Amino acid sequence: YYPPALTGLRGSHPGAFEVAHQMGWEKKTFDVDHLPIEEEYDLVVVGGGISGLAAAWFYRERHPAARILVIENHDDFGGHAKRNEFQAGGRTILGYGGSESLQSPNALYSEDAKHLLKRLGVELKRFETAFDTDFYPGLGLSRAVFFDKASFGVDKLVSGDPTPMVADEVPRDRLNARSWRAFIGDFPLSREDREALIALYESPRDYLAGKSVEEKETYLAKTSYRDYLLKNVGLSETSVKYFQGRSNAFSALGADALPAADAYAAGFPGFDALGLPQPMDEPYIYHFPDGNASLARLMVRDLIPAVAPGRGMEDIVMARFDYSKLDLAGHPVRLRLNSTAVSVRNRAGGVDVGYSRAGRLHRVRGKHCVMACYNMMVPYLLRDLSEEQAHALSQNVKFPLVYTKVLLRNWQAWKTLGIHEIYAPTLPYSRIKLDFPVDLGSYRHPRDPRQPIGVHMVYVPTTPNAGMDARTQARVGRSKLYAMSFEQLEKDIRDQLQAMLGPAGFDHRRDITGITVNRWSHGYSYFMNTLYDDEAESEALMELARSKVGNVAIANSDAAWDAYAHAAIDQAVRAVREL
Ligand SMILES: Cc1cc2nc3c(=O)[nH]c(=O)nc-3n(C[C@H](O)[C@H](O)[C@H](O)COP(=O)(O)OP(=O)(O)OC[C@H]3O[C@@H](n4cnc5c(N)ncnc54)[C@H](O)[C@@H]3O)c2cc1C
Ligand code: HEM
Numbered sequence: 001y002y003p004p005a006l007t008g009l010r011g012s013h014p015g016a017f018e019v020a021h022q023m024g025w026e027k028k029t030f031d032v033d034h035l036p037i038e039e040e041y042d043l044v045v046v047g048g049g050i051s052g053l054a055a056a057w058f059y060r061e062r063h064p065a066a067r068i069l070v071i072e073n074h075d076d077f078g079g080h081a082k083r084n085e086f087q088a089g090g091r092t093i094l095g096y097g098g099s100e101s102l103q104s105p106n107a108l109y110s111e112d113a114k115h116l117l118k119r120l121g122v123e124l125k126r127f128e129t130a131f132d133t134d135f136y137p138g139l140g141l142s143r144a145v146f147f148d149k150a151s152f153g154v155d156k157l158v159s160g161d162p163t164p165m166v167a168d169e170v171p172r173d174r175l176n177a178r179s180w181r182a183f184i185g186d187f188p189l190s191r192e193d194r195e196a197l198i199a200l201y202e203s204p205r206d207y208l209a210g211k212s213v214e215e216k217e218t219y220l221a222k223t224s225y226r227d228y229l230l231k232n233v234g235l236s237e238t239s240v241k242y243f244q245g246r247s248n249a250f251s252a253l254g255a256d257a258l259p260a261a262d263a264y265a266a267g268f269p270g271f272d273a274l275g276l277p278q279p280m281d282e283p284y285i286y287h288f289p290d291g292n293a294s295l296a297r298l299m300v301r302d303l304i305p306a307v308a309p310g311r312g313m314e315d316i317v318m319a320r321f322d323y324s325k326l327d328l329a330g331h332p333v334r335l336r337l338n339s340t341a342v343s344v345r346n347r348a349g350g351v352d353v354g355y356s357r358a359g360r361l362h363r364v365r366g367k368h369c370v371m372a373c374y375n376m377m378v379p380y381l382l383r384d385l386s387e388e389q390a391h392a393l394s395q396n397v398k399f400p401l402v403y404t405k406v407l408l409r410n411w412q413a414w415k416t417l418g419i420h421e422i423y424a425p426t427l428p429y430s431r432i433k434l435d436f437p438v439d440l441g442s443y444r445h446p447r448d449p450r451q452p453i454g455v456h457m458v459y460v461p462t463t464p465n466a467g468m469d470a471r472t473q474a475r476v477g478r479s480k481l482y483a484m485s486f487e488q489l490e491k492d493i494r495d496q497l498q499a500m501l502g503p504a505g506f507d508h509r510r511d512i513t514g515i516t517v518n519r520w521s522h523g524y525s526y527f528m529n530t531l532y533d534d535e536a537e538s539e540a541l542m543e544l545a546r547s548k549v550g551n552v553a554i555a556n557s558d559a560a561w562d563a564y565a566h567a568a569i570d571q572a573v574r575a576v577r578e579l
Contacts, residue, residue: 001323003076004083004290009486010097011082011402011518016074019340019356023380030342032354032363041067043579044353044366046341046381048072049079050099050292050565051555052372053299054116054572056333059370060303062576068303068333069364071355073340073373077326078296080523081565086407086514088452092318094443095405095435095454096291097518103167103564104282113569120298121312124286131285132437132445136420137174141434144419146500147188151241151426155499158186159418166250166266169284169436176418193239200233204273207232216274217261221530225263226255226465233270243268245430246423248460252399252524256464257473259530287436289317289443292565297321303333317441344369345383346550368551368579372572374398374522375545375558384549392545396558397471400478401523402459404429404493407452407514413504415449422500428492432457432500452513459492469532478521489517524563525556546571553578 022028043059045052048070056068076082082097105124144159160178177183180201184194208216220228229235229243243255247266251258264271265279288294298316301308306325310316326335342361343354351369355362371378376398379390414420414434421433435454437445446453461477468476493515498508528538546559553575557568
């Protein structure tokens with residue numbers, strides 16, 4: 001039993017969601033109050049992502065003798081933080097299934113989050129040498145933009161992209177980029193379109209001239225980035241398609257759904273002459289080879305020492321995890337996989353929890369409970385919620401995303417084209433890249449273009465320019481993914497890689513040796529969007545949603561309306577203190 005070596009349809013895989021949807025879609029209830037209580041714990045945690053694991057860890061720090069049960073519906077622990085493995089050339093190649101890197105941790109990680117990192121042996125400075133920052137730039141590789149036939153008349157890859165991005169691992173002086181005029185000059189757009197794009201960068205003007213600074217901020221909060229480019233900068237409908245998908249990977253929405261103020265904060269072009277006040281700079285290098293799955297693995301090994309030997313950040317990378325040790329009776333911490341919580345109820349100074357596993361209901365009991373699952377799931381579980389609080393929890397509509405890992409036999413085609421990363425403005429996969437090169441522990445990142453390498457590509461099922469709000473794009477994105485077979489997902493992967501790399505000799509039937517699709521149908525937590533949400537009413541809803549209910553506290557990154565691992569930790573810490 002070893003989920004990380006499984007390929008194919010992963011993420012929220014078949015088997016993980018069916019009981020959840022029986023509750024969510026069919027409104028079936030699974031009451032367990034006529035079943036005998038089978039086990040008792042000090043703490044029961046619903047949900048085995050980073051938030052739930054942190055809740056267990058901080059609970060145990062406060063109560064060293066505590067008996068803790070973690071209930072998790074997927075076949076692996078970690079929630080969005082998942083380890084993916086490939087076997088190639090007799091060596092393991094690691095990928096991350098979801099939760100990707102520690103985001104600007106020097107600036108954003110709270111005291112408690114840094115305390116967890118220290119106790120687990122994670123030294124942030126180690127990544128200043130573990131991350132091979134100059135590997136790809138030193139090979140002369142650059143980022144590129146792929147324009148597709150269907151939207152631009154021709155397939156064309158344009159390299160040398162100088163576009164600075166929010167979470168950038170490449171030092172600016174090492175982008176191997178070209179001037180805006182040279183770069184944009186190769187775009188397969190009309191001469192007029194190209195000269196307006198170049199002017200955007202070479203001749204910024206105050207597109208909101210006359211307005212005060214406060215009026216500009218108000219306008220930009222209620223205007224989408226796409227409408228600002230269209231109505232105020234004056235770009236054509238064809239020119240703005242270049243910007244449609246740029247924000248998909250980081251925000252799970254396109255330029256039609258992001259306020260122009262948020263594009264400004266993320267360094268998008270078009271604001272340089274508006275006279276706006278100061279708001280991206282921390283190097284994006286805090287990346288284990290399996291992403292933030294290493295954080296989950298570090299906590300699990302620390303909470304359940306029998307699952308794996310070693311201590312510290314180095315030996316976790318290749319540590320062998322024995323999943324049969326996760327849920328042993330008598331062990332004070334038990335992690336119960338493949339299990340959907342269906343009921344949570346305060347009773348007699350404690351909490352009764354029902355869960356379903358392999359089609360059968362079970363009842364356990366805790367002194368305390370932390371609900372670290374998707375917040376939208378809580379109203380279907382927590383029988384004590386007021387109607388007001390249940391409605392608030394349901395307002396956190398999460399964003400769907402797909403992280404796909406592809407094993408290439410070699411990456412000579414990437415070398416030939418001079419690229420390590422591609423942006424595709426109007427294709428399903430908007431970001432395709434050679435994986436981050438990290439050496440940590442005994443793991444060595446692939447180096448030889450003649451030999452296998454992992455590729456990472458992000459697909460966000462947006463519905464741009466439709467007049468939808470963000471919650472509706474998210475829901476509709478999930479219906480689209482629900483309609484797609486694995487075979488359909490694989491055809492998109494293969495078709496796009498063939499069209500982008502094919503001119504340099506790539507043959508997808510021969511050069512792809514592995515595919516892992518991490519389908520995160522419920523991905524990023526919702527976040528307050530000033531195009532569609534009132535800030536004061538959103539703050540109130542968020543605060544109400546996560547209010548403690550007896551001895552049941554609410555966590556997950558969802559509870560912060562903030563899709564980050566440090567939010568997951570901070571929300572768990574708040575949940576544990578409330579108990
Ligand atoms: C594709 C992707 C990439 C990301 N990249 C980054 C990144 O680079 N940096 C960063 O800081 N953050 C990133 N994130 C944010 C990510 O959500 C957090 O980092 C963190 O992994 C979330 O932890 P969590 O415990 O709050 O939620 P989750 O990881 O989602 O854990 C909640 C768990 O509870 C389970 N659950 C739900 N209902 C039930 C039930 N009834 N019974 C039992 N279990 C249940 C869910 O299935 C899930 O496994 C990314 C997210 C996604 C989707
Ligand atoms: C294959 C993976 C999945 C797909 C394709 C999928 C798809 C969908 C769709 C289309 C909806 C309706 C739109 C919405 O309300 O957001 C939905 C809702 C829901 N999903 Fe999923 N989902 C998946 C996985 C999961 C998982 C892992 C869970 C929880 C363990 C889950 C729990 C729910 C719940 C509770 C709802 C109802 C939300 C509400 O009523 O507020 N789903 N899902």
